[PDB]
């Protein structure tokens, strides 16, 4: 048996707090302020990915690149470790050549 | 409308409801089930399943075909191989209809690109414009046009109506300046100097046949009565046209901007053009 | 060292322009090139096509699969099956059967089977559009 | 609720504090200075002289 | 995490906070300062700029030294460089 | 007497403008207190329903940094010994007592480190959605127009029964022009309230405008918002980011 | 080929192709007819005339190596006096 017997406590969702309400606020900014900033400059986050995308490989070579020499070195280690490990299956390994 | 009469009796448009357009967001494959994945697609046992076939070329050991063909200097020295990008008559005759270039003002590189004509990128070794003689035939404007090129024809098209047609030469350091200056006046350096042609291209901007920048302001004549006579018109006197003053007007070499002076300072800011004082400078610059 | 000089006048000279300029008021037509403006006022049909940002003919060519030729009339407003008759009818004689076309009443645009963009901008230019 | 005030651009000249080890190498220097100045004018302070 | 300044300014970050912070301005500009010494074991190139001669175009230049290594011994000589 | 209002850009010559009441939050019964025109293309546009999911779903997604991760097999404590040789015993081979098969092993395909959702669509199609959803909430007797949203009092009973009176609908999104002109008595209502929400018109989106049923414009702001989603049809391609300075460009 | 770099993370090109194949821009491939410069002297003369020639590379040539390539080699360039400029384009093609 794997199925719980009562029933959850629930889970009230208050579809009207601040952060709900004014979602999506300012993400017209460039187009409606004259260009001063861009939706990007809104992205909050880590910094090495405010405002930019890609697969796992370039995601870590980002990181390495920009906080790289601010890393604990065994977060640091897995990381090389990490990037080797891709390229090598990304470059060789895979349905398609 | 019609649709916006549909909209007042349906419901309130939200969240709720949106969609996507159909045929849009093709659907996911994921190897579950007995079609999908009972080998997921990747076939029997063998180096193609496991994800270690050779790579990209590799012909099974036979010489690849990549190999096999011999060398050729198809594409050696291409960084280097200098590019322009055409600028045909139909096209100038359309952007003047449509006005986006004036032909009332001396046309230069900077003014085909503020008016989107040509798109020029100096970062691929482009280094301008070139006339080209497509559309010579219903070419009807009188334009002072200042290029990088030109075909004879393309200067028959331009003299045959009264107009002045002159090649000049850019660096690439500098036709990324004349190509999108503001930039450029962002970046804080005073306008720098243009530098003269490479060895190889001296012959070309120092002969009258080509309208050179460089060729002597006498010889001129004699080429344009011998393109006229070769190509039957009668070369228009432009000495008494009503603006030939701006016909007239051409860049010395050594100049960027029409009436800017190498070694000025542009501050957009505060709308002024700081010029240097300092001997030295000045020597520098006016050479 | 240095001292301010405020003639500016070669450098606006220099900044470009976000708006499209409106072509100026030509003598003739067709100008050198082949463009005419729309008339004026508006032909009085079920429809209309208007012109673009830079005041052309929306026709359009367009491939798929390096063989299907196709063209599209884009920014149809009105009644688009209107504008599907008068091709149909239009082009019939031309090909020697009806072409078959799509309509796209969402987006306001009419595709249709073959290359005919020159013959369609001309069409479109004699109903004043 | 009243949304918060609207994300504006960092106003007027940017010059980062030369002492502080973090400042980049690049941020301090005749260029930067060069582009504040184009960009700002008088304003920004920098002696015109030294363009 | 993240530490808060990097790596390789951990050092100077020690000379600003101890006992180093007190020793005098003219000696710690002396040790930060870094100099190349003197080409001693190579053939540094004339100039900034070259032409060199596979393709014909005028490329940039530089000098990257090589390593040596100085075992302890030569602390109580004078080896030159 | 009256407070009318023309279209100032230039409207296509087979087109007439479209037209709302111009009402007050001064009174309860003050609604037609003037007559405003507004521009067809950008309160008349097609229906178009598919860009708005379009814009809504990249309003959605374009901010996401999914903070999930996941240790994979080489980053889970120790697993480094072969457990027991290949051949001489009967149980199963294994190379690490951490591959994912193992218990509190890792996982073969998990979250793998904080993942960014980032992309952004064309500028004219953001546009083309905003004037989308003004239309939308204009054809469905939703949008308003308000001299300005003056207030007798800041009490927030006052306005909450004035939304009740004129059937706006539960949720209010109210659009004023500057964040630093506001009245005093407005932003003293609205900041009590819940779903009525008060932001300048630099703020306005179609999430946020699908979200509140009503949605409640001053007249500068149309204004304002004609010029800036006007400027998209009929611009030429940039050469350079609109942020640098142009010649027509304020 | 390698599909994603170690060091900036983009696709890169087989350099051993760019020295022996043209990109006509709008597809084709040109090559050599190798066994051409060497061993000229027991050639026929009408071996050594079909040996000069330059020709076509088939539709799977083409595409592989059009994978050995990134996008930079498949531009649209404007050379000054470029003996293959006319070739760039097809003309009257029937699917
Ligand atoms: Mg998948
Ligand atoms: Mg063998
Ligand atoms: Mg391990
Ligand atoms: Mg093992
Ligand atoms: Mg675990």
Redesign the pocket.
């Given at each position: 048996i794997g199925i719980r017997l009562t029933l959850p406590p629930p889970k009230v969702v208050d579809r009207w707090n601040e952060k709900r309400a004014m979602f999506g606020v300012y993400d017209n900014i460039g187009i409606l302020g004259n260009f001063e900033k861009h939706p990007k400059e809104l992205i909050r986050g880590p910094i090495w990915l405010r405002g930019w995308k890609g697969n796992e490989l370039q995601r870590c070579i980002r990181k390495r690149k920009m906080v790289g020499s601010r890393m604990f070195a065994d977060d640091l280690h897995n990381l090389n470790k990490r990037i080797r490990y891709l390229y090598k299956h990304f470059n060789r390994h895979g349905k398609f050549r | 409308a019609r649709a916006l009469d549909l909209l007042r009796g349906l419901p309130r448009v939200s969240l709720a409801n949106l969609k996507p357009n159909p045929g849009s967001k093709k659907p996911e494959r994921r190897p579950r089930g007995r079609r999908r994945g009972r080998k997921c697609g990747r076939g029997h046992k063998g180096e193609r399943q496991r994800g270690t076939r050779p790579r990209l070329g590799f012909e099974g050991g036979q010489t690849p075909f990549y190999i096999r063909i011999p060398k050729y200097g198809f594409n050696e020295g291409h960084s280097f191989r200098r590019q322009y990008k055409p600028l045909s008559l139909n096209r100038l005759q359309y952007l003047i209809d449509l006005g986006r270039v004036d032909p009332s003002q001396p046309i230069d590189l900077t003014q085909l690109v503020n008016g989107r004509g040509v798109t020029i990128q100096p970062l691929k070794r482009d280094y301008g414009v070139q006339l080209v003689e497509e559309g010579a035939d219903t070419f009807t404007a009188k334009v002072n046009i200042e290029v990088q090129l030109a075909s004879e024809l393309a200067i028959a098209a331009i003299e045959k109506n009264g107009g002045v047609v002159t090649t000049a030469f850019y660096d690439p350091r500098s036709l990324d300046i004349v190509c999108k200056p503001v930039p450029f006046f962002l970046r804080g350096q005073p306008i720098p100097k243009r530098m003269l042609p490479p060895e190889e291209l001296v012959p070309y901007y120092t002969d009258a046949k080509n309208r050179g920048y460089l060729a002597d302001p006498a010889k001129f004549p004699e080429a344009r009565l011998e393109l006229a006579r070769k190509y039957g018109y009668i070369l228009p006197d432009i000495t008494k046209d009503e603006l030939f003053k701006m016909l007239c007007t051409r860049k010395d070499p050594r100049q960027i901007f029409f009436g800017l002076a190498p070694g000025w300072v542009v501050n957009m800011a505060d709308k002024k053009i700081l010029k240097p004082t300092d001997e030295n400078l000045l020597k520098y610059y006016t050479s | 060292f240095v001292e301010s000089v405020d003639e500016y006048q070669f450098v606006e000279r220099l900044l470009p322009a976000t708006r499209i300029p409106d072509p100026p008021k030509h003598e003739h037509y067709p100008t050198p090139s082949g463009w005419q403006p729309p008339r004026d006022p508006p032909p009085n049909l079920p429809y209309f096509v208007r012109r673009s940002r830079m005041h052309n003919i929306p026709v359009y060519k367009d491939i798929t699969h390096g063989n299907r030729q196709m063209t599209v009339i884009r920014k149809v407003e009105g009644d688009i099956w209107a504008l599907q008759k008068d091709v149909e009818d239009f082009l019939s004689p031309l090909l020697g059967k009806t072409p078959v076309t799509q309509v796209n009443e969402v987006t306001g645009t009419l595709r249709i089977k073959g290359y005919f963009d020159q013959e369609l901008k001309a069409w479109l230019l004699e109903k004043g559009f | 609720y009243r949304a918060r005030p609207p994300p504006r651009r960092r106003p007027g000249p940017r010059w980062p504090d030369p002492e502080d080890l973090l400042t980049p190498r690049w941020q301090l220097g005749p260029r930067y200075a060069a582009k504040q100045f184009a960009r700002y004018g008088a304003a920004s302070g920098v002696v015109p002289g030294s363009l | 995490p993240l530490h808060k300044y990097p790596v390789w300014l951990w050092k100077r970050l020690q000379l600003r906070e101890g006992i180093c912070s007190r020793l005098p301005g003219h000696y710690l500009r002396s040790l930060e300062e870094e100099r190349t010494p003197t080409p001693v074991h190579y053939r540094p190139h004339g100039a900034k700029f070259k032409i060199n001669p596979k393709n014909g175009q005028r490329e940039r230049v530089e000098d990257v030294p090589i390593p040596i290594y100085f075992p302890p011994e030569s602390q109580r000589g004078l080896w030159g460089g | 007497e009256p407070v009318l209002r023309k279209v100032e850009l230039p409207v296509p010559t087979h087109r007439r403008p479209v037209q709302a009441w111009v009402e007050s939050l001064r009174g309860f019964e003050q609604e037609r207190v003037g007559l405003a025109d507004l521009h067809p293309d950008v309160f008349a546009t097609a229906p178009r329903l598919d860009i708005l999911h379009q814009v809504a779903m990249w309003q959605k997604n374009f901010k996401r940094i999914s903070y999930a991760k996941?240790?994979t097999r080489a980053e889970?404590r120790g697993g480094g010994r072969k457990p027991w040789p290949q051949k001489g015993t009967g149980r199963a081979r294994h190379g690490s007592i951490r591959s994912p098969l193992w218990r509190?092993?890792?996982?073969a395909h998990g979250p793998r480190g904080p993942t960014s959702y980032y992309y952004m669509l064309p500028m004219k199609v953001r546009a083309l959605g905003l004037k989308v959803a003004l239309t939308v909430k204009l054809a469905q007797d939703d949008l308003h127009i308000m001299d300005s949203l003056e207030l007798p009092t800041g009490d927030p009973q006052y306005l909450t029964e004035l939304a009740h009176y004129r059937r706006w609908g539960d949720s209010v999104l109210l659009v004023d022009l500057t964040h630093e002109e506001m009245p005093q008595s407005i932003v003293e209502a609205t900041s009590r309230l819940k779903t009525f929400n008060l932001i300048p018109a630099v703020g306005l989106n179609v999430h946020s405008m699908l979200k509140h049923q009503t949605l409640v414009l001053t007249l500068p702001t149309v204004a304002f918002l004609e010029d800036k989603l006007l400027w998209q049809d009929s611009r030429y391609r940039p050469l350079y980011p609109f942020s640098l300075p142009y010649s027509d460009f304020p | 080929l390698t599909y994603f770099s170690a060091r900036k993370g983009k696709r890169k090109t087989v350099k051993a192709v760019i020295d022996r194949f043209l990109r006509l821009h709008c597809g084709l491939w040109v090559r050599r007819k190798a066994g051409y410069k060497k061993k000229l002297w027991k050639k026929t003369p009408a071996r050594k005339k079909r040996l000069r020639e330059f020709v076509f590379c088939n539709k799977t040539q083409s595409k592989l190596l059009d994978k050995m390539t990134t996008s930079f080699w498949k531009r649209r360039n404007w050379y000054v006096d470029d003996p293959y400029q006319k070739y760039h384009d097809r003309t009257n093609l029937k699917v």
């Open positions: - | - | - | - | - | 996941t240790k889970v509190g092993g890792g996982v | -």
